[PDB]
Amino acid sequence: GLGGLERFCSPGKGRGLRALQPFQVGDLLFSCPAYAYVLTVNERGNHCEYCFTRKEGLSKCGRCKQAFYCNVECQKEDWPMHKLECSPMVVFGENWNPSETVRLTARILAKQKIHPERTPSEKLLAVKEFESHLDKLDNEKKDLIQSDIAALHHFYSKHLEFPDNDSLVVLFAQVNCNGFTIEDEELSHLGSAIFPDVALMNHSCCPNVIVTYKGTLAEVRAVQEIKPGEEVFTSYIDLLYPTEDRNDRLRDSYFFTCECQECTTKDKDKAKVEIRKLSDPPKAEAIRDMVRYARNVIEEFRRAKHYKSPSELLEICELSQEKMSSVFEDSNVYMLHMMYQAMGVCLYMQDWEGALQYGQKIIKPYSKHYPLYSLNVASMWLKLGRLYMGLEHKAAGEKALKKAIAIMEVAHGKDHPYISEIKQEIESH
Numbered sequence: 001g002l003g004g005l006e007r008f009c010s011p012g013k014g015r016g017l018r019a020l021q022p023f024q025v026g027d028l029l030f031s032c033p034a035y036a037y038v039l040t041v042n043e044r045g046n047h048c049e050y051c052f053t054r055k056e057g058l059s060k061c062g063r064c065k066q067a068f069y070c071n072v073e074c075q076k077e078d079w080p081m082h083k084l085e086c087s088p089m090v091v092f093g094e095n096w097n098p099s100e101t102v103r104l105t106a107r108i109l110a111k112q113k114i115h116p117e118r119t120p121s122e123k124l125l126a127v128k129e130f131e132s133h134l135d136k137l138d139n140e141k142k143d144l145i146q147s148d149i150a151a152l153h154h155f156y157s158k159h160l161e162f163p164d165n166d167s168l169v170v171l172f173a174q175v176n177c178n179g180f181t182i183e184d185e186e187l188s189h190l191g192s193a194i195f196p197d198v199a200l201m202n203h204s205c206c207p208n209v210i211v212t213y214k215g216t217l218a219e220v221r222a223v224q225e226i227k228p229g230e231e232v233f234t235s236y237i238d239l240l241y242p243t244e245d246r247n248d249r250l251r252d253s254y255f256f257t258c259e260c261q262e263c264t265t266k267d268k269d270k271a272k273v274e275i276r277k278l279s280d281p282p283k284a285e286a287i288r289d290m291v292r293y294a295r296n297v298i299e300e301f302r303r304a305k306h307y308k309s310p311s312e313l314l315e316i317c318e319l320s321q322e323k324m325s326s327v328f329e330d331s332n333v334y335m336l337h338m339m340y341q342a343m344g345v346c347l348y349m350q351d352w353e354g355a356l357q358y359g360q361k362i363i364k365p366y367s368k369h370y371p372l373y374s375l376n377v378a379s380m381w382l383k384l385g386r387l388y389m390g391l392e393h394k395a396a397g398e399k400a401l402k403k404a405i406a407i408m409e410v411a412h413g414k415d416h417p418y419i420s421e422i423k424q425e426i427e428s429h
């Protein structure tokens with residue numbers, strides 16, 4: 001196993017990770033190399049397929065022209081995994097579209113055939129031992145898994161010997177329960193991976209650890225002091241939202257209800273759903289209605305970004321904020337979500353001024369709603385800093401870049417390449 005830690009039976013939480021020694025804020029508890037991993041399609045050409053290094057001048061795979069590498073070594077090392085997609089991409093052509101979940105599951109199957117023995121990524125929890133929640137699956141989820149199984153057979157039958165359908169619904173449910181997405185310093189999606197020992201950790205809305213990535217390596221660092229005997233908890237979800245919203249997401253994606261201090265006390269719920277203080281305050285029924293509206297526009301926008309124009313997307317943000325502002329304060333998390341979505345539309349449109357004015361309204365409430373060390377508030381400071389720097393506002397930029405570094409030093413470690421990059425950005429301008 002891992003030094004200073006141990007696997008244990010967490011009452012009402014199945015298996016978990018327990019500390020056998022003290023850990024201070026910013027200490028690295030452990031690292032876990034990716035068992036299986038996949039670079040997201042939209043990041044091809046930007047990062048090396050094998051090690052996830054973000055570099056200019058990456059070598060293109062001559063066969064498929066859709067895999068990029070640091071050099072010939074990264075290329076040869078990725079071939080046992082790349083071989084699953086190389087020829088299929090050119091033969092299926094435009095028809096090649098398996099979901100990221102399917103791309104990852106294919107590599108797990110390939111890894112199980114090549115390396116059946118326990119890997120260095122499985123010191124405490126093995127891939128085969130993963131929780132699946134098979135018995136909890138409803139018709140909607142079973143249908144989704146069946147769509148994934150059909151795509152797995154459709155695109156990856158060349159090198160893989162598949163187990164029966166029942167073993168594959170168990171596998172896909174394990175991947176849903178235990179899979180990780182890898183994000184960059186701005187929380188932008190890079191890919192998906194399997195980190196078995198990292199999947200041992202249970203959830204808390206007040207976590208004592210944070211997971212970050214150093215290429216394909218997962219790193220676990222304390223964001224609170226951890227004493228011997230204490231369970232080590234990470235957050236599975238976005239902690240901006242009130243208790244009900246967090247537990248709806250936790251029940252839906254992870255089949256459990258959280259009972260952490262935050263969910264029990266609901267301390268942050270009041271400010272998260274802050275109401276405008278006005279002559280004749282809004283009635284309880286007016287609040288519940290606005291909240292119902294808010295959750296519906298979130299869903300509406302999520303669907304809309306796939307097919308609506310950037311001006312239509314901003315229109316939804318601006319109009320929903322207008323309707324909500326009659327009842328809701330600007331610091332209210334539903335206003336924040338729409339402002340964050342509007343900021344993203346500006347960034348894509350390269351409207352740096354527009355992005356900056358949204359970010360400026362988001363950062364103070366973010367700090368108030370998120371825990372002391374948070375990747376979401378670090379990433380927002382970083383975005384804000386780069387916007388200021390880009391728009392020639394160097395003093396405001398250096399200040400925001402340093403605010404981001406202060407959180408990142410705890411979460412990513414002092415020596416993290418993302419911090420060396422940000423420091424080079426402070427140096428240059």
Ligand SMILES: O=C(NCCCN1CCCC1)c1cc(-c2ccccc2N2CCN(CCc3ccc(Cl)c(Cl)c3)CC2)nc2n[nH]cc12
Pocket residue numbers: 101104141142144145173175176177178179180181182192193198199235236237252253254
């Ligand atoms: O890293 C992520 N979250 C942080 C905490 C992760 N840790 C890791 C150990 C504990 C928590 C994260 C991972 C994934 C991810 C990565 C790989 C494969 C499938 C992934 N997804 C899983 C969720 N699924 C949603 C719908 C669903 C749910 C259950 C079922 Cl059964 C079905 Cl059918 C469909 C979609 C696929 N995705 C994500 N999205 N947002 C966030 C996501």
Ligand SMILES: C[S@@+](CC[C@H](N)C(=O)[O-])C[C@H]1O[C@@H](n2cnc3c(N)ncnc32)[C@H](O)[C@@H]1O
Pocket residue numbers: 012013014015016130131177178199200201202203204254255256257258259
């Ligand atoms: C990635 S696994 C974590 C390790 C898991 N406990 C095991 O024994 O394999 C995620 C699953 O653990 C359970 N879990 C995690 N955090 C929990 C919590 N705070 N309360 C209850 N169950 C939790 C849920 O069943 C969830 O789907």
Ligand SMILES: [Zn+2]
Pocket residue numbers: 048049050051052053069070071074
């Ligand atoms: Zn590389």
Ligand SMILES: [Zn+2]
Pocket residue numbers: 061062063064065066067082085086087
């Ligand atoms: Zn290729």
Ligand SMILES: [Zn+2]
Pocket residue numbers: 204205206258259260261262263
């Ligand atoms: Zn909680």
